Write an enzyme that holds these catalytic residues in place. Structure first.
Site, short mmCIF file in Angstrom:
data_model
loop_
_atom_site.label_atom_id
_atom_site.label_comp_id
_atom_site.label_asym_id
_atom_site.label_seq_id
_atom_site.Cartn_x
_atom_site.Cartn_y
_atom_site.Cartn_z
N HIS A 138 -41.10 50.99 72.66
CA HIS A 138 -39.84 51.19 72.80
C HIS A 138 -39.11 52.54 72.62
N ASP B 155 -29.18 73.31 97.58
CA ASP B 155 -30.41 72.65 96.94
C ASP B 155 -30.62 73.01 95.74
N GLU C 238 -36.33 68.39 70.86
CA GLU C 238 -36.33 67.23 71.90
C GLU C 238 -34.99 66.44 71.64
N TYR D 170 -32.03 67.66 70.48
CA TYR D 170 -31.06 68.53 71.23
C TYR D 170 -30.92 68.34 72.67
N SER E 97 -17.88 66.69 78.03
CA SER E 97 -16.61 67.68 78.39
C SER E 97 -16.06 67.43 79.70
N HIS F 24 -38.09 67.08 59.14
CA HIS F 24 -38.76 65.76 59.42
C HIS F 24 -40.27 65.63 58.41
N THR G 89 -21.45 72.39 66.18
CA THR G 89 -21.21 71.05 66.60
C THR G 89 -19.92 70.49 66.57
N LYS H 220 -17.48 71.85 68.97
CA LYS H 220 -17.44 71.09 70.26
C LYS H 220 -16.53 69.78 70.03
C1 HEA Z 1 -29.33 62.57 69.95
C2 HEA Z 1 -30.33 62.87 69.13
C3 HEA Z 1 -30.17 63.41 67.63
C4 HEA Z 1 -29.25 64.34 67.26
C5 HEA Z 1 -28.03 64.90 68.43
C6 HEA Z 1 -29.43 64.57 66.01
C7 HEA Z 1 -28.78 65.39 65.14
C8 HEA Z 1 -28.90 65.74 63.75
N1 HEA Z 1 -29.94 65.04 62.95
FE1 HEA Z 1 -31.02 63.65 63.59
N2 HEA Z 1 -32.64 62.40 64.46
C9 HEA Z 1 -32.93 61.98 65.52
C10 HEA Z 1 -32.14 62.27 66.54
C11 HEA Z 1 -31.00 63.04 66.55
N3 HEA Z 1 -30.64 63.81 65.55
C12 HEA Z 1 -34.03 61.18 65.59
C13 HEA Z 1 -34.59 60.40 66.83
C14 HEA Z 1 -34.77 61.27 64.32
C15 HEA Z 1 -35.82 60.54 63.82
C16 HEA Z 1 -37.08 60.89 64.46
C17 HEA Z 1 -38.25 60.22 63.69
O1 HEA Z 1 -38.55 59.98 62.77
O2 HEA Z 1 -38.71 59.04 64.87
C18 HEA Z 1 -33.66 62.34 63.78
C19 HEA Z 1 -34.13 62.42 62.27
C20 HEA Z 1 -33.47 63.30 61.32
C21 HEA Z 1 -33.83 63.90 60.06
C22 HEA Z 1 -34.95 63.55 59.29
C23 HEA Z 1 -34.86 62.39 58.55
C24 HEA Z 1 -36.02 61.77 58.15
O3 HEA Z 1 -36.78 61.42 58.62
O4 HEA Z 1 -36.05 61.54 56.72
C25 HEA Z 1 -32.89 64.87 59.69
C26 HEA Z 1 -32.87 65.53 58.66
O5 HEA Z 1 -32.00 66.84 58.32
C27 HEA Z 1 -31.76 64.94 60.84
C28 HEA Z 1 -30.48 65.70 60.63
C29 HEA Z 1 -29.78 65.90 61.82
C30 HEA Z 1 -28.68 66.77 61.60
C31 HEA Z 1 -28.15 67.65 60.61
C32 HEA Z 1 -28.09 66.63 62.97
C33 HEA Z 1 -26.88 67.65 63.50
O6 HEA Z 1 -27.37 67.90 64.85
C34 HEA Z 1 -25.71 66.81 63.35
C35 HEA Z 1 -24.34 67.74 63.46
C36 HEA Z 1 -23.25 66.94 63.88
C37 HEA Z 1 -22.13 66.75 63.17
C38 HEA Z 1 -22.18 67.08 61.66
C39 HEA Z 1 -20.94 65.77 63.60
C40 HEA Z 1 -19.86 66.62 64.42
C41 HEA Z 1 -19.27 67.85 63.32
C42 HEA Z 1 -18.11 67.84 62.84
C43 HEA Z 1 -16.76 66.63 63.00
C44 HEA Z 1 -17.73 68.90 61.91
C45 HEA Z 1 -17.39 68.77 60.50
C46 HEA Z 1 -18.80 68.39 59.77
C47 HEA Z 1 -19.31 68.82 58.68
C48 HEA Z 1 -18.33 69.79 57.97
C49 HEA Z 1 -20.33 67.93 58.04
N4 HEA Z 1 -32.11 64.05 61.76
C1 HEA Z 2 -32.77 57.03 73.53
C2 HEA Z 2 -33.33 56.24 72.12
C3 HEA Z 2 -33.14 55.02 71.87
C4 HEA Z 2 -32.32 53.95 72.22
C5 HEA Z 2 -31.26 54.10 73.25
C6 HEA Z 2 -32.42 53.09 71.44
C7 HEA Z 2 -31.89 51.57 71.39
C8 HEA Z 2 -32.17 50.54 70.51
N1 HEA Z 2 -32.95 50.33 69.42
FE1 HEA Z 2 -34.34 52.06 68.93
N2 HEA Z 2 -35.53 53.66 68.55
C9 HEA Z 2 -35.71 54.73 69.02
C10 HEA Z 2 -34.89 55.35 70.06
C11 HEA Z 2 -34.07 54.46 70.72
N3 HEA Z 2 -33.55 53.26 70.51
C12 HEA Z 2 -36.71 55.44 68.34
C13 HEA Z 2 -37.05 57.13 68.85
C14 HEA Z 2 -37.22 54.68 67.41
C15 HEA Z 2 -38.30 54.94 66.42
C16 HEA Z 2 -39.74 54.83 66.73
C17 HEA Z 2 -40.93 54.74 65.83
O1 HEA Z 2 -40.28 54.30 64.63
O2 HEA Z 2 -41.84 55.48 65.98
C18 HEA Z 2 -36.47 53.56 67.34
C19 HEA Z 2 -36.72 52.45 66.37
C20 HEA Z 2 -35.84 51.29 66.43
C21 HEA Z 2 -35.82 50.52 65.49
C22 HEA Z 2 -36.92 50.59 64.24
C23 HEA Z 2 -38.00 50.04 64.26
C24 HEA Z 2 -38.97 50.26 62.79
O3 HEA Z 2 -38.71 51.05 62.35
O4 HEA Z 2 -39.56 49.11 62.58
C25 HEA Z 2 -34.97 49.37 65.88
C26 HEA Z 2 -34.87 48.02 65.02
O5 HEA Z 2 -33.74 47.47 65.01
C27 HEA Z 2 -34.53 49.71 67.02
C28 HEA Z 2 -33.40 49.00 67.75
C29 HEA Z 2 -32.72 49.40 68.99
C30 HEA Z 2 -31.80 48.44 69.58
C31 HEA Z 2 -31.57 47.12 69.28
C32 HEA Z 2 -31.58 49.31 70.73
C33 HEA Z 2 -30.35 48.94 71.58
O6 HEA Z 2 -29.18 49.75 71.14
C34 HEA Z 2 -30.68 48.76 72.98
C35 HEA Z 2 -29.46 48.44 73.93
C36 HEA Z 2 -29.50 48.75 75.42
C37 HEA Z 2 -29.05 49.88 75.76
C38 HEA Z 2 -28.62 51.04 74.93
C39 HEA Z 2 -28.97 49.98 77.13
C40 HEA Z 2 -30.60 50.79 77.56
C41 HEA Z 2 -30.25 51.09 79.16
C42 HEA Z 2 -29.79 52.16 79.86
C43 HEA Z 2 -28.69 53.04 79.19
C44 HEA Z 2 -30.04 52.24 81.23
C45 HEA Z 2 -28.48 52.35 82.00
C46 HEA Z 2 -28.63 51.95 83.74
C47 HEA Z 2 -27.83 52.80 84.31
C48 HEA Z 2 -27.13 53.73 83.68
C49 HEA Z 2 -28.05 52.52 85.84
N4 HEA Z 2 -34.66 50.99 67.40
O1 LIG Z 3 -34.25 65.16 65.02
O2 LIG Z 3 -32.90 65.35 64.23
CU LIG Z 4 -34.74 66.99 63.52
#
Ligand code: HEA
Ligand code: HEA
Ligand SMILES: [O-][O-]
Ligand SMILES: [Cu+2]
Ligand SMILES: CCCCCCCCCCCCCCCCCC(=O)OC[C@H](COP(=O)([O-])OCC(O)COP(=O)([O-])OC[C@@H](COC(=O)CCCCCCCCCCCCCCCCC)OC(=O)CCCCCCCCCCCCCCCCC)OC(=O)CCCCCCCCCCCCCCCCC
Ligand SMILES: CCCCCCCCCCCCCCCCCC(=O)OCC(COC(=O)CCCCCCCCCCCCCCCCC)OC(=O)CCCCCCCCCCCCCCCCC
Ligand SMILES: CCCCC/C=C\C/C=C\C/C=C\C/C=C\CCCC(=O)O[C@H](COC(=O)CCCCCCCCCCCCCCCCC)COP(=O)(O)OCCN
Ligand SMILES: CCCCCC/C=C\CCCCCCCCCC(=O)O[C@H](COC(=O)CCCCCCCCCCCCCCC)COP(=O)(O)OC[C@@H](O)CO
Ligand SMILES: CCCCCC/C=C\CCCCCCCCCC(=O)O[C@H](COC(=O)CCCCCCCCCCCCCCC)COP(=O)(O)OC[C@@H](O)CO
Ligand SMILES: CCCCCC/C=C\CCCCCCCCCC(=O)O[C@H](COC(=O)CCCCCCCCCCCCCCC)COP(=O)(O)OC[C@@H](O)CO
Ligand SMILES: CCCCCCCCCCO[C@@H]1O[C@H](CO)[C@@H](O[C@H]2O[C@H](CO)[C@@H](O)[C@H](O)[C@H]2O)[C@H](O)[C@H]1O
Ligand SMILES: C[C@H](CCC(=O)O)[C@H]1CC[C@H]2[C@@H]3[C@H](O)C[C@@H]4C[C@H](O)CC[C@]4(C)[C@H]3C[C@H](O)[C@]12C
Ligand SMILES: C[C@H](CCC(=O)O)[C@H]1CC[C@H]2[C@@H]3[C@H](O)C[C@@H]4C[C@H](O)CC[C@]4(C)[C@H]3C[C@H](O)[C@]12C
Ligand SMILES: C[C@H](CCC(=O)O)[C@H]1CC[C@H]2[C@@H]3[C@H](O)C[C@@H]4C[C@H](O)CC[C@]4(C)[C@H]3C[C@H](O)[C@]12C
Ligand code: CUA
Ligand SMILES: [Mg+2]
Ligand code: NA
Ligand code: NA
Ligand SMILES: [Zn+2]
Lengths: 84, 58, 514, 227, 259, 105, 94, 48
Positions: free
Chosen positions: C61, C91, C242, C244, C255, C291, C316, C319
């Site tokens: 998934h 291109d 990744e 980001y 934007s 992490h 962030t 933005k």
């Molecule tokens: C689109 C993907 C995406 C993005 C953009 C982010 C953004 C951030 N992530 Fe996330 N993160 C994941 C995808 C993402 N993450 C994934 C996939 C994992 C799990 C991987 C795995 O284990 O499988 C994960 C795991 C993860 C962890 C590890 C947790 C754990 O495993 O125990 C942490 C810990 O610090 C973290 C923190 C953050 C923070 C601080 C941001 C920041 O960039 C967010 C900053 C944004 C805001 C804060 C909101 C907007 C701001 C305002 C309105 C301003 C005012 C706000 C304040 C003053 C607070 N992320």
């Molecule tokens: C981009 C990343 C992404 C997205 C979109 C999703 C979408 C969803 N995920 Fe996923 N998920 C992960 C990344 C993502 N996940 C990751 C990284 C993990 C951790 C894996 C690990 O633990 O190792 C995870 C783990 C995770 C778990 C935890 C499993 C566990 O810990 O046992 C669950 C359980 O509910 C879950 C559920 C879902 C569901 C219900 C959606 C639904 O929201 C999906 C609904 C459908 C969509 C969002 C549409 C998708 C299709 C398109 C957008 C194509 C569009 C076509 C055109 C534009 C032409 N996800």
């Molecule tokens: O990776 O948050």
């Molecule tokens: Cu991280």
């Protein structure tokens, strides 16, 4: 550093050829001499079946599975020791 | 060696519509056919191997 | 001609179309996998099998959604279609290398599918940690097929990164400086720099895992003096950049969409947006060990990673507030794309803020490896990256195809998806706070109510995905051809008509310097 | 343990877990406030026919929305890091206990005095005694003295696991070749549950942790009887 | 007809054959590791070499023979090569990180020391030092070759490029002999793992860089390069300096500091 | 920096230019409505008379509509502006959108 | 032994590369490598926009350092104005 | 009246409340009576 040499004015092929033959290749020749003097086998040490060495978690995909790719019978023991 | 770049320029600028990978002449077509045949036949073979490896074999 | 055009392409638009089709097909695979996850968890007990089949599904998934759906769509799809048009270039810099970035992806996906068909699949998590992923606990070909899948996806993106960076630096009109290029172009450039630097480190780490599995190295095996935690550092050195990479092109599309449907000629605070994306890109390389707060790390290291991670909130937030300031005073058009972008601003912010909770290493001890993390990242991925993809898809579908969608159907689709994703993931905060672990096929009975609601939500999102397919069908079936598009003076990608000719900007734009 | 429809953290069993609860309350208030402010401003921007579409100067307002978030982060980081270092402070344990993760069960070693060790497996659902909890009970619980500072050392003899007890605020990865230390102090007698918290294969979901906290004299007699 | 200076490339099959070669090499490595067969791997390696040959052949046709490499196109290729080298630097950085992680904190299984108990490292003053002088010398000779080309001197360009290649070959032969003579192997714990995988990928890049220099040598024999336009030579020289610098880091880190 | 009165006078001068052309009329009105204000009657007066010099009755009506639009929910602004403009409307024969039925949906 | 034998671009450049080189020597820019320098942009002194057809896209950076570029088609005929700043442009087809 | 795909590069008509005076007239071609109406528009609008 300015190294210890010192010859510009408009850099060029002539200077780099000068460096190639007057410094670079002589240094290679010196190091080639040094290495041929210190070659000659060293005594292979007693074999000890240390567990952090001669690792085998899966057979190698060649040979009998138990020989490394550039296995040298003289200096590379098997997990059971040097070959006969 | 003599410089024959000019004659290669004439050959590869000839107004014959050929794409650059075929513009050297008949040897290009042969090497292309060999490359593509190995790639497509090899890809089919990799799919056969997947079919084989997807099931247990005692 | 068909083979020449579609298998031998050197055209940025057709290759972009190939990526969009590939990513849409991957999105169906990833959706099916998500429904299997939530079917397993939708009532207490065991549906499918034990945690091995369950976590092969979970692992696939994630890889499918990240590597085959989001990155191909945002970077390969919108990036190829829009970047050359937005800078008036004829291109990409390397148009034939571009085609190989695309064609590496079907083999990468085949390798992932193979991994799940042979032996018992790769039930490792998308992080692929040893020793579970090593050759004793995951004997056989599945993990190696997964590694090779990542290798090919990584080459694809690294060569694509080289292409985008070169194109954006070298192929703008000579009068256009980097501070006159649109924000989506900036977002793709910065994403490409992150890809260029991070994917080789992943490649190194997974290659070490491959040699530990097959050549008797011991990088990660303590019996040889290796360390499983070394793998985690190398993986997450890639894996934070990744995420980001997954959001930055989304920020760029948001934007453009917010600017356009606010009736504005420009986003609020352009140089602050550039600054914020660069700052996020840079800070995204120095935070990876958040992490790893439970692996046994010294307290001072935990303090550093807590603080460095939280700092990213500042750019962030610029933005987010700049998007709101772009809406301010707008002639708001309530188009479906605008709805996607407004949902993005709010839900991304919620997910970012739960990320800031997790950045606190003391709280993360209790929240790590629980559904609170799952809730954080699905708000930023399912309600962030994907909302930006849907917004950009609906907004630019008439450019790419020459046809219009039915806007009422597209608003219906947004409404269903919005209910579905929030019902799916909001309760997962409660499950995480109360201690439900990640990667579980079943849970203690107390967790039943929120797991039941969460799974019901996942079925609502399924209905939205099916309706999306019908909506695309209806547009191609009815053939309403675009006539006029407003705001072309500040949206160059529309100025060659819909769809643009195969070759655009054969004569480059005229931009003088003064 | 968690109870049905629970929204927040399990009740604190240790002082450090109580600190985390108060710190989470502080942070969640800020999360709610910022989320709601953004939602409200979105609605504000979208609810007027008045327009202003000419170029807007950004410099002044960007001071506000950089400085205010920096201040907020500092207001989070200060109590966050205080708990971090308090968590880390020297305490001097009375007792050391090791736990070794395995596929799929935990073993425990209490070797300060005698060689005491045993395995701890989930009770299968079909063998639960009436009123026992599905997926959470074990056959041999981790009996420990209450109101005492305990050093737990965590490792693994096969793949990664992670030793977690949410109501004590504990989660320490179990890594082969590594000996990770954490400290545990229960303010109360009772039974405190946790679950393996690093994916470890086929029965990851089914290798739970149960601590049994009793007075020292009971713990001593239990220890002697387990030899 | 265009009035910009960029290159619209003819539709080409090599991207597809390259991608399929990648599928065949990776599925082939899988077949070799798990199903005792080299068949798919040999096909993939073959189609990979055919793809590279015809693709870079076509780039030469497009530039030397067809004139498509205007200054704007050349500038793009310069950025392309620099970014490619940057990605390769980061790839090696992961292996240096593995090396320092394991050697700065040697675990009990090693004896708690570095080098591990039972490891007898090569003497860094013998062949490793010789290899260092060889690559350094080749960085001097390739610079002479570059200056001779810019000065229009065909014979000394060829001489200097030939000496550079000879030194690249010498390094590879010395390294091959050192691999055979080494008393430790890739299976000798993390010492052997870091040593052979890092110097091994380095050796692969030396072979790649040597092959690239040899391509430039034969294009030079055929007069393809002008005194001002010779980006393939510049790219091969940049890549060669990258190979030299990675070696110096390996020498200082693994052979010397880690001995 | 510019007072309200200075801003209004610049805009009056702009529309009052005797040989203002059609492009400048449109540029002026489409730029003006970007601002956070409803234009003062004296500005609209000058724009309407520009319409007259350009023989463009329809754009005069359209300008009155955009005055109403810029006021948003402030329903008191447009009747006030029309009241102030009545001598000009009568002098030039400009009918209001309401008098033309163009306020009907 | 400073000898020769390496061709020059003058001798051996071909195709578009040679066209660009020969035009630069004449001070011409048929392949749009340089940014054109603006005139005062009045109706009397419009920016002259060369084209090989009867319309070309103009981007107008209205003021120095604007990040927003204003894009529009310029057609053969009477000079047109940038819709943001009014500066004049006239197509010169050839 | 009729807008064509092949007109995409020409100034176009739009109804936008924030762009009140579009770049072209809605109707470009005039009948005999519409021509006479545009002539009459050059006289006092009170007589319309
Ligand atoms: C689109 C993907 C995406 C993005 C953009 C982010 C953004 C951030 N992530 Fe996330 N993160 C994941 C995808 C993402 N993450 C994934 C996939 C994992 C799990 C991987 C795995 O284990 O499988 C994960 C795991 C993860 C962890 C590890 C947790 C754990 O495993 O125990 C942490 C810990 O610090 C973290 C923190 C953050 C923070 C601080 C941001 C920041 O960039 C967010 C900053 C944004 C805001 C804060 C909101 C907007 C701001 C305002 C309105 C301003 C005012 C706000 C304040 C003053 C607070 N992320
Ligand atoms: C981009 C990343 C992404 C997205 C979109 C999703 C979408 C969803 N995920 Fe996923 N998920 C992960 C990344 C993502 N996940 C990751 C990284 C993990 C951790 C894996 C690990 O633990 O190792 C995870 C783990 C995770 C778990 C935890 C499993 C566990 O810990 O046992 C669950 C359980 O509910 C879950 C559920 C879902 C569901 C219900 C959606 C639904 O929201 C999906 C609904 C459908 C969509 C969002 C549409 C998708 C299709 C398109 C957008 C194509 C569009 C076509 C055109 C534009 C032409 N996800
Ligand atoms: O990776 O948050
Ligand atoms: Cu991280
Ligand atoms: C011949 C029938 C083949 C049928 C298919 C069979 C299978 C073949 C597999 C691959 C073969 C591809 C070549 C087919 C050539 C057909 C004619 C004149 C320009 O002239 C040239 O370009 C001359 C090209 C010389 C190529 C030199 C290869 C050198 C190999 C390196 C050995 C280095 C070792 C250093 C260490 C040594 C230790 C002892 O213009 C050109 O020819 C354009 C030429 C192509 C330029 C780019 C070529 C790079 C390709 C690289 C693939 C190589 C992989 C090598 C990896 C390392 C393996 C050794 C020319 C023919 C020979 C090409 C050999 C390559
Ligand atoms: C934000 C995403 C959109 C909303 C998605 C679904 C909306 C559902 C409401 C949801 C509407 C927002 C209200 C959230 C709080 C509701 C639960 C609570 O009392 O939370 C308590 C805490 C723990 O606290 C405790 O330990 C004390 C327990 C007190 C028990 C009292 C009894 C309560 C009755 C049962 C409530 C059932 C919950 C319903 C279950 C809901 C199932 C879907 O849990 C938690 O921290 C959960 C942590 C969530 C972190 C993300 C914050 C996002 C905020 C966005 C709001 C913006 C404006 C709102 C307005 C937002 C409108 C869009
Ligand atoms: C001779 C001079 C140096 C020239 C280069 C030689 C080989 C380079 C090949 C590629 C190197 C890349 C890493 C491959 C990993 C191991 C090779 C390490 C270098 C090497 O050759 O190591 C040899 C082991 O080779 C072995 O296991 C197996 C050797 C063959 C197996 C290759 C396995 C496939 C590797 C796939 C890597 C995928 C990379 C993708 C990256 C994309 C991003 C060491 O021999 P030994 O008998 O153990 O000890 C010597 C004792 N007398
Ligand atoms: C486990 C084993 C897995 C193995 C996976 C192998 C996967 C891929 C198979 C590779 C087949 C390669 C075939 C040759 C490709 C040559 C590309 C090239 O040379 O691309 C050039 C651009 O890239 C440039 O310069 C600079 C960039 C050059 C890149 C050369 C190819 C590198 C491929 C490997 C990259 C790995 C990066 C690793 C870092 C970790 C030219 O671009 P074009 O668009 O063609 O032309 C434009 C025209 O104007 C030219 O006249
Ligand atoms: C600008 C500087 C920012 C900080 C970067 C610092 C990098 C290197 C720090 C090395 C510290 C070693 C100090 C010597 C004694 C203690 C070693 C030790 O025992 O620390 C061990 C970690 O080791 C290790 O290799 C750590 C290996 C390096 C990881 C660095 C990550 C950067 C990777 C991309 C570049 C634990
Ligand atoms: C085993 C697999 C690897 C095997 C060996 C591959 C060796 C590399 C050979 C590359 C040959 C490229 C020849 C084409 C070339 O050099 O093309 C030049 C363009 O450069 C260009 O594309 C530059 C493109 C070259 C990029 C090559 C970089 C090496 C890629 C190797 C793959 C890395 C694998 C890493 C694994 C960890 C042509 O322009 P000029 O020279 O200016 O000529 C024009 C003048 O004549 C006009 O007057
Ligand atoms: C694109 C995704 C591809 C995923 C790749 C996964 C790895 C594929 C390699 C598997 O190849 C198979 O290996 C078998 C074992 O070597 C061969 O059977 C061979 O061995 C069998 C078992 O002994 C015997 O029945 C047969 O005689 C003999 O053909 C079989 O022919 C071959 O095809
Ligand atoms: C044939 C050619 C003459 C120049 C020309 O073709 O006009 C000469 C000049 C430089 C010569 C090469 C260089 O002097 C370097 C090499 C010297 C070795 O002794 C023979 C091979 C070697 C590679 C030479 C082969 C051949 O004699 C070359 C290539
Ligand atoms: C996490 C990484 C170790 C990776 C490894 O074990 O392989 C180490 C190496 C260098 C360390 C950093 C350096 O020691 C410098 C800083 C030291 C401070 O006490 C903590 C933050 C600080 C910024 C460290 C954080 C972290 O422990 C780093 C980055
Ligand atoms: C100087 C630079 C570019 C200005 C320009 O040439 O247009 C601008 C663009 C974004 C600006 C930054 C952002 O607006 C965010 C911060 C805002 C604070 O008010 C000052 C520091 C702050 C970090 C700014 C410093 C500086 O004014 C920046 C970096
Ligand atoms: Cu043990 Cu999960
Ligand atoms: Mg974990
Ligand atoms: Na279940
Ligand atoms: Na040069
Ligand atoms: Zn302008």
């Amino acid at each position: 550093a300015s190294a210890a040499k010192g010859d510009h004015g408009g850099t060029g092929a002539r200077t780099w050829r000068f460096l190639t033959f007057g410094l670079a290749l002589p240094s290679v020749a010196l190091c080639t001499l040094n290495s041929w003097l210190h070659s000659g086998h060293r005594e292979r040490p007693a074999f000890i079946p240390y567990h952090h060495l001669r690792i085998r978690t899966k057979p190698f995909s060649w040979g009998d599975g138990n020989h490394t790719f550039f296995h040298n019978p003289r200096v590379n023991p098997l997990p059971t020791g040097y070959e006969k | 060696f003599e410089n024959r770049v000019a004659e290669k320029q004439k050959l590869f600028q000839e107004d014959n519509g050929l794409p650059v990978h075929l513009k050297g002449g008949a040897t290009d077509n042969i090497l292309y056919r060999v490359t593509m045949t190995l790639c497509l036949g090899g890809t089919l073979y990799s799919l056969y191997c997947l079919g084989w490896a997807s099931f247990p074999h005692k | 001609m068909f083979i020449n055009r579609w298998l031998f392409s050197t055209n940025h638009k057709d290759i972009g179309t190939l990526y969009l089709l590939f990513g849409a097909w991957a999105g169906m695979v990833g959706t099916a996998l998500s429904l299997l996850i939530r079917a397993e968890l939708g009532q207490p007990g065991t549906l499918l099998g034990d945690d091995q089949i369950y976590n092969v599904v979970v692992t696939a998934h994630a890889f499918v959604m990240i590597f085959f759906m989001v990155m191909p769509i945002m970077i390969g799809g919108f990036g190829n279609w829009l970047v050359p048009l937005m800078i008036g270039a004829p291109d990409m810099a390397f148009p034939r290398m571009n085609n190989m970035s695309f064609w590496l992806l079907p083999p990468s996906f085949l390798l992932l599918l193979a991994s799940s068909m042979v032996e018992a699949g790769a039930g490792t998590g998308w992080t692929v940690y040893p020793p579970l992923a090593g050759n004793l606990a995951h004997a056989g070909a599945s993990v190696d097929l997964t590694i090779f899948s990542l290798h090919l996806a990584g080459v694809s993106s690294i060569l694509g990164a080289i292409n985008f960076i070169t194109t954006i630096i070298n192929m703008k009109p000579p009068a256009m400086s980097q501070y006159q290029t649109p924000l989506f172009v900036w977002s793709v450039m910065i994403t490409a720099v992150l890809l260029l630097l991070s994917l080789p480190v992943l490649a190194a780490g997974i290659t070490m895992l491959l040699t530990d599995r097959n050549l008797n190295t011991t990088f990660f095996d303590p019996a040889g003096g290796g360390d499983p935690i070394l793998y985690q550092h190398l993986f997450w050195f890639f894996g934070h950049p990744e995420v980001y990479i997954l959001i930055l092109p989304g920020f760029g599309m948001i934007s453009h969409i917010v600017t356009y449907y606010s009736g504005k000629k420009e986003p609020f605070g352009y140089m602050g947006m550039v600054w914020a994306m660069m700052s996020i890109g840079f800070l995204g390389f120095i935070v990876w060990a958040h992490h790893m707060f439970t692996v046994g790390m010294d307290v001072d290291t935990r303090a550093y990673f807590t603080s460095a991670t939280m700092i990213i909130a500042i750019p962030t937030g610029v933005k987010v507030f700049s998007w709101l300031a772009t809406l301010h005073g707008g002639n708001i058009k309530w188009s479906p794309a605008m709805m996607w972008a407004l949902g993005f601003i709010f839900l991304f912010t919620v997910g970012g803020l739960t990320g800031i909770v997790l950045a606190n290493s003391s709280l993360d001890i209790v929240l790590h490896d629980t559904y609170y993390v799952v809730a954080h990242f699905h708000y930023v991925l399912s309600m962030g990256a994907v909302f930006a993809i849907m917004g950009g898809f609906v907004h630019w579908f008439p450019l790419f195809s020459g046809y219009t969608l039915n806007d009422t159907w597209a608003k219906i689709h947004f409404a269903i998806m919005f209910v579905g994703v929030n019902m799916t993931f909001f309760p997962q905060h409660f499950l995480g706070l109360s201690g439900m672990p990640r990667r579980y096929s079943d849970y203690p009975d107390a967790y039943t109510m929120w797991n039941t609601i969460s799974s019901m939500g996942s079925f609502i999102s399924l209905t939205a995905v099916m309706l999306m397919v019908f909506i695309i069908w209806e547009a191609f079936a009815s053939k309403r051809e675009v006539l006029t598009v407003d705001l072309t003076t500040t949206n160059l990608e529309w100025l060659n008509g819909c769809p643009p000719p195969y070759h655009t900007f054969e004569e480059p734009t005229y931009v003088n310097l003064k | 343990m968690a109870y049905p429809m629970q929204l927040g953290f399990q009740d604190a069993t240790s002082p450090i877990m109580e600190e985390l609860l108060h710190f989470h309350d502080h942070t969640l208030m800020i999360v709610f406030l910022i989320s709601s402010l953004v939602l409200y401003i979105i609605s504000l921007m979208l609810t007027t026919k008045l327009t202003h579409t000419s170029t807007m100067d950004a410099q002044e307002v960007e001071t506000i929305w950089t400085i205010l978030p920096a201040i907020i982060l500092i207001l989070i980081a200060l109590p966050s890091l205080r708990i971090l270092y308090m968590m880390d402070e020297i305490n001097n344990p009375s007792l050391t206990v090791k736990t070794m993760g395995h596929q799929w069960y935990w073993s425990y070693e209490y070797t300060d005095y005698e060689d005491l060790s045993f395995d701890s497996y989930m009770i299968p659902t079909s063998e639960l005694k009436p009123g026992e909890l599905r997926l959470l009970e074990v056959d041999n619980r981790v009996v420990l003295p209450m109101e005492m500072t305990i050093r737990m050392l965590v490792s693994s003899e096969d793949v990664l696991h992670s030793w977690a007890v949410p109501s004590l605020g504990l989660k320490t990865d179990a890594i082969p070749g590594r000996l990770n230390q954490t400290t545990l102090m229960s303010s109360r007698p009772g039974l405190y549950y946790g679950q393996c918290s690093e994916i470890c294969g086929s029965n990851h979901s089914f290798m739970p942790i149960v601590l049994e906290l009793v007075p020292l004299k009971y713990f001593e007699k239990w220890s002697a009887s387990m030899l | 007809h265009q009035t910009h200076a960029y290159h619209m490339v003819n539709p080409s099959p090599w991207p597809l054959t390259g991608a399929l070669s990648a599928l065949l090499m990776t599925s082939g490595l899988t077949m070799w590791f798990h199903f005792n067969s080299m068949t798919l791997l040999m096909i993939g390696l073959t189609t990979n070499m055919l793809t590279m040959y015809q693709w870079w052949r076509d780039v030469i046709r497009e530039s030397t023979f067809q004139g498509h490499h205007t200054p704007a196109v050349q500038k793009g290729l310069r950025y392309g090569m620099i970014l490619f080298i940057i990605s390769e630097v980061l790839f090696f950085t992961g292996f240096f990180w593995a090396f320092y992680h394991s050697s700065l904190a040697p675990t009990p299984e090693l004896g708690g020391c570095w080098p591990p108990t039972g490891i007898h490292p090569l003497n860094p003053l013998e062949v490793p030092l010789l290899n260092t002088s060889v690559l350094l010398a080749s960085g001097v000779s390739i610079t002479w070759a570059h200056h001779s080309l810019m000065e229009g001197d065909r014979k000394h360009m060829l001489q200097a490029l030939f000496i550079t290649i000879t030194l690249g070959v010498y390094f590879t032969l010395l390294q091959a002999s050192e691999y055979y003579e080494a008393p430790f192997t890739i299976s000798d714990g993390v010492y052997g793992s870091t040593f052979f995988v890092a110097t091994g990928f380095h050796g692969l890049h030396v072979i790649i860089g040597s092959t690239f220099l040899i391509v430039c040598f034969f294009r030079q024999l055929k007069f393809h390069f002008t005194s001002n336009h010779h980006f393939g030579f510049e790219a091969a020289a940049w890549y060669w300096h990258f190979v030299d610098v990675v070696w110096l880091f390996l020498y200082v880190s693994i052979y010397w500091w880690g001995s | 920096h510019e007072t309200d009165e200075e801003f209004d006078a610049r805009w009056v001068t702009y529309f009052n230019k005797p040989d203002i052309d059609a492009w400048e009329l449109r540029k002026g009105m489409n730029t003006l409505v970007g601002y956070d204000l409803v234009p003062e009657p004296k500005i609209i007066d000058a724009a309407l008379r520009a319409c007259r010099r350009l023989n463009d009755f329809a754009s005069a009506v359209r300008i009155l509509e955009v005055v109403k639009d810029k006021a948003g929910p402030h329903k008191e602004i447009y009747p006030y502006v029309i009241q102030e403009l009545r001598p000009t409307l009568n002098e030039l024969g400009i009918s209001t959108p309401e008098e033309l039925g163009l306020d009907k949906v | 032994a400073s000898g020769g034998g390496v061709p020059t671009d003058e001798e051996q450049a071909t195709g578009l590369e040679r066209e660009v080189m020969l035009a630069a020597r004449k001070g011409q820019d048929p392949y749009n490598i340089l940014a054109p320098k603006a005139t005062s942009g009045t109706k009397e002194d419009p920016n002259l926009v060369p084209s090989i057809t009867n319309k070309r896209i103009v981007g107008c950076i209205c003021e120095e350092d604007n990040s927003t570029v204003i894009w529009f088609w310029l057609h053969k005929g009477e000079a047109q104005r940038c819709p943001s700043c009014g500066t004049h442009y006239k197509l010169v087809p050839h | 009246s009729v807008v064509k795909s092949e007109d995409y590069a020409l100034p176009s008509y739009v109804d936008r409340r924030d762009y009140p005076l579009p770049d072209v007239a809605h109707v470009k071609n005039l009948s005999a009576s519409q021509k006479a109406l545009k002539e009459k528009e050059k006289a006092s609008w009170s007589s319309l």
